[PDB]
Amino acid sequence: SLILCIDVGNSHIYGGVFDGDEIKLRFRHTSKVSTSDELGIFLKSVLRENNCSPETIRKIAICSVVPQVDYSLRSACVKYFSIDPFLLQAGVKTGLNIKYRNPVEVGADRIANAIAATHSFPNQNIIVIDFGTATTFCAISHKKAYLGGAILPGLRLSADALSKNTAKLPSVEIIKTESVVGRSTIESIQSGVYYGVLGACKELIQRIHHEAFNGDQILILATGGFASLFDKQGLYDHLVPDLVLQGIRLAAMMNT
Amino acid sequence: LILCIDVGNSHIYGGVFDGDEIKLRFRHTSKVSTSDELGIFLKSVLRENNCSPETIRKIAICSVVPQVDYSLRSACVKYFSIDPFLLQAGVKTGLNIKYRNPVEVGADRIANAIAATHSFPNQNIIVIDFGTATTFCAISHKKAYLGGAILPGLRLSADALSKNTAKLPSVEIIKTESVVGRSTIESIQSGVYYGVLGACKELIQRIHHEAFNGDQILILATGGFASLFDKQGLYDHLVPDLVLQGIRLAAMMNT
Amino acid sequence: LILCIDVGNSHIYGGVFDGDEIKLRFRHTSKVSTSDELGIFLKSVLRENNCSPETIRKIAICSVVPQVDYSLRSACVKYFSIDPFLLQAGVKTGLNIKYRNPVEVGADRIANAIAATHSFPNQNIIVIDFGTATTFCAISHKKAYLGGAILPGLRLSADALSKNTVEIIKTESVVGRSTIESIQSGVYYGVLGACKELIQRIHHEAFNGDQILILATGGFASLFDKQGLYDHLVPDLVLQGIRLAAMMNT
């Protein structure tokens, strides 16, 4: 009765074994081109080497936004674990009213956020912010209706696209900046992308607050890798770093 | 008549002046590569817009892509018989740069400050450029370039989301009206419009409190994507040819 | 004189009509170009071919690549003072689109369907384009684009083999005694039979076995004139139907 959850994202393949409610172990793999044996050898070794026998995993649930790793992870599960995994796909039970034109366009990771956000915080209007590969914003009503949202590039994708498409301009590690007026080009990208997403969040919060929720009170939820660089500030109420893996389990239980 | 040429990372942007006013403007790719190639284009771009190539007796070049420099300079001497003005490190700009290394400041950021502190001589200036990158530059009233910030532009943001994120398509940049996107196409448009809008709002007010700490300022916007933020009250002035103006003023300072 | 421009994936194909007939034709690569780059090519390519650019009174554009569409429009207004006809969403095509989403159909597929039905009026038509892709389109006698199929082209298929592991000639052998011969025997006989499998399976799915006409167009269309696969080779079909779409929208 140890479940396993996987988020196949663009930056990483992200896993976490839940013993009921609390995560005993989390792991990471690169989302590359891999076979069901390569992924099968990995999933067993990554469990075993961290005080956790592979033969104890009773259920697997899968969430993905990369279709090219989909067949090979499903096939890895049916070979190395004897589990046909739960696929977070359209249209299983979610408990949510998708307000998109095409409900299939909403990625399963944003759905998993919205499932966990409305479980952990049941009766409030929610903005969820993922500071991951992208910087996604999503509005959800208190009646569990996924309204939609906005998608920006991440802090890595902001600082790397500058170095990629411009000559004589380097790449930089993301840290918190104190001053907005850089006396180096290196300090201009630091001030620019830090205080740029810091104002992008503030603006997207208030535009959505008044437009999606007509002025009603909200709960702001943060998740993702670059989330803890903004706890000083504005900006959001709860930092829930496992909001994706929580809701994969929570979608697997809706479909058991 | 002077030909002013800006070499950016996506566009070579040129333009001709008849003393003070601009007769003609043109664009090119920062790609095409030989002196023969550039020299055919420069001569045919002037001729098809009713402006004989032989009338050009002055050329001035600001550039930020060094791989275009050699053959563009070489395109000028072969086809026009003009050794162009190079907006470089060591040439007479009428300003002190407050960088730790004043060679690290690009030629376009200098040229925008030159033209800004010429047009509005005794005011603190925040110049925003909306191009390949969205740049914020802080210049004080005594012609001092203090540095500033750089963001990825509107086009570089959207194209980062279509390349590094699978199952996400490339989008058009419009003045978006719905902040809550009902499609993947609409979510990215709302993101690259209200994301930069608040990034402008934040960076402008933070610079105002740090470099100037509450003093009087004048906001100047330039760039290709600058037209989309007219309605807001985000900038005081919109100067579409601010880079091409400052190449002319720096050539004037060094002629 | 009317200048018709067809934006493809590989080449921006262009022609200029002296009323009914094409006087001169030219080709440009589909790439990154500004309005000044496009207009300089456009004004020059006429002028070097004994055609003053000022004789051109009409411009009509069919496009499949959106990243060329703004600067190509803006080239015509600056260098010719002509606002071009854009075969796009909403314009008078004069036919019945049977797709799920009618705007998902390419502008090249509409222009081909318009022209073929004009020259051959009361007939059911399969139009094969042998271009960047090899496309098959079922159009009925009642001016109804029922749909069809899209294979990879001869160039794309031969290039994808070399990419992840050649000159397209009329092969006489299937048993290649070299690795160069085996790829050439591959794309020839494997599309000659792809056509037979497409031409005949559509023949019953779209016309239930009725009397049809098979038109072929493109650059790789010539290499199948021996086998008796299609009836007519019309190389300028796309350009005819940009002119025709401009005529209905005059």
Added chain:
Amino acid sequence: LILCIDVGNSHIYGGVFDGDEIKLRFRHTSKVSTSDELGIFLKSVLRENNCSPETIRKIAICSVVPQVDYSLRSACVKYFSIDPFLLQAGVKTGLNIKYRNPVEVGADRIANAIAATHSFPNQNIIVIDFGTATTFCAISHKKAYLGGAILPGLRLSADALSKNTAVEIKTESVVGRSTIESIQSGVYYGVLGACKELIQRIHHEAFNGDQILILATGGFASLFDKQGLYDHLVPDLVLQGIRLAAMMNT
């Protein structure tokens, strides 16, 4: 117990035999790797599938990607203490390679031909390999490898279209009413008739109307188990022929 490895352009395909029958098969990606990575993977992929690494007494390798060969050979002396049989130009194959330069024929095409003529001995055979590329090999009843044709794969064809324009691999619909629908109406029925043409042309150019037999190997072979394209579906044809080639040379 023999470990047989096929090194292809997209995959390393391996299998362990207990004599004639197969008890385990596996797959790795063909990338730049080291002898240590490959030797960890190999020892791991065996043990976790209940075949203990120490039971392997022979290793036999056939390869078509020369840059994977050195580290995979070295992985066997370091981690298994076996210098593997290499299916290289010059070893005993038992077949007359009628190519102009017989070294051109890949080890994969040779391995399939050895296995095809061992299992179905005195017969003319078309072996089709639905892999990276769709290959058609002609082999006579006299065990002469005559040559053949190479079409790009079904994956390469579905990817070439999307890559060079501004889908997942049975299609019942020939007339497409979507772009994602016309692409698989094109792909499925295009290679279906490609094979149909290639088969009967090889059947008449190489075998002049004689009784042939058709074998199909590869991961995309099962998509044509309905249409009566081939006689036999042998999915491990490449691995049987490595095992047979080792046997001839040991």
Added chain:
Amino acid sequence: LILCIDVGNSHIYGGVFDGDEIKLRFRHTSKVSTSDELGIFLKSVLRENNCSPETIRKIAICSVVPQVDYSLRSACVKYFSIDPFLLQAGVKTGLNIKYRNPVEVGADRIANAIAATHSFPNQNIIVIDFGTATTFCAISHKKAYLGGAILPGLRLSADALSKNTAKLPSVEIIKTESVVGRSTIESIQSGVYYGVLGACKELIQRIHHEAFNGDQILILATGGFASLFDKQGLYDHLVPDLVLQGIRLAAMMNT
């Protein structure tokens, strides 16, 4: 007036000969162009450089990039009304190729050999082309093309160190005086100048003592990086236009 075209991997290189001497030279970026893009440039680059396109009577094409060949040949028949001479398999070269596959030799190495052994008619020659790749060719006094060797060019040897490395810049190719560089920039320059200098020295006298056994030879050198080794007594003659000379010579041989 004869027009000689070379198609290298970096550039399309042209030069119009007034009989024996080159009136004008030019350059086009070797990209997949069309039959019409190429035809515009050729008639424009001549016209802007005081040489009318009609005065050209013949054309001669050397090629190593086959993808540029179809449309450049088409650019001549359509726009110039001239069917170009093509230097390839079949035509008169006046050489005996000692390659295992005589087709595998590039047309430009064939071009170079024809000019070298015309300028220096009874000698053993090692020709070194310091271009994109630094190639070496042994040619006997009997005009036997025996073959040779090919090294990465000085630009390749610099760009390989930076593009295939994290934390290493791309460097300028200068004549340095030290081999003990005390900066990263200096270390690559000292290696990329003195690594090639010794590579040339070894490839010269390995071929001298194996293809010519130890007899009288003459070392010619062509290319854009040839003049960096002019001091060191490496070669006998710097011939800048060795390719175009050899294209014109082969045109003459076959007309």
Added chain:
Amino acid sequence: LILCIDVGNSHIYGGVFDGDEIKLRFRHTSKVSTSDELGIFLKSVLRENNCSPETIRKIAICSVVPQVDYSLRSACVKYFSIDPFLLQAGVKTGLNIKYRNPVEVGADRIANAIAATHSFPNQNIIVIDFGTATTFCAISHKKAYLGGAILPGLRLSADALSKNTVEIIKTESVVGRSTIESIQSGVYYGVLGACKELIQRIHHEAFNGDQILILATGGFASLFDKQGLYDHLVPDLVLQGIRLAAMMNT
């Protein structure tokens, strides 16, 4: 027992010392990798080569790729619980770096210098590292790192030729009668002469006539043993000098 890890531009080269001698060396490709991907690999490579990961109590890391840095650090503190020694800016080395900025000397050049001055204590040393870059290093007998030269390596040189227009062999003749033989005969005798020039120029410049000891290391070093080029071939020179710098510190 101590693990020394050399992060290169192509390979991550590890080694386990039990006192003075290497018991096992291994190799991983320098890729985008996580702490979990690397930590699994590390614990797995040791065990498969008769060495339990629990017996390792010390880890040292020299690195030239700073993107490998963070995740390799994390894999040490998690999967091994050993916070690794980093040969970085500021650690004790016991040598005078005569660079204008001593920081810009790669951590891999410091490791080669340390080990050469340890093994051969009172001698002027050239060290040639035939790796990704073919590097040259002048170290005086008083242990002054005087600087040096950097060439592209044998792999990058050959691969630059085919990416802009082979497998690395010791060629017997300069006269290539093939394109393959021409790239083989330029790269072999080119680096042979490059060495001969960069050895003889450093000898006259950095020491200036006096006795020198030429040492060779790296993977492409093996091919030049015949030409009397270097004095000693120490293939583990980097790993020894990673160990020695950990011995000088912590």
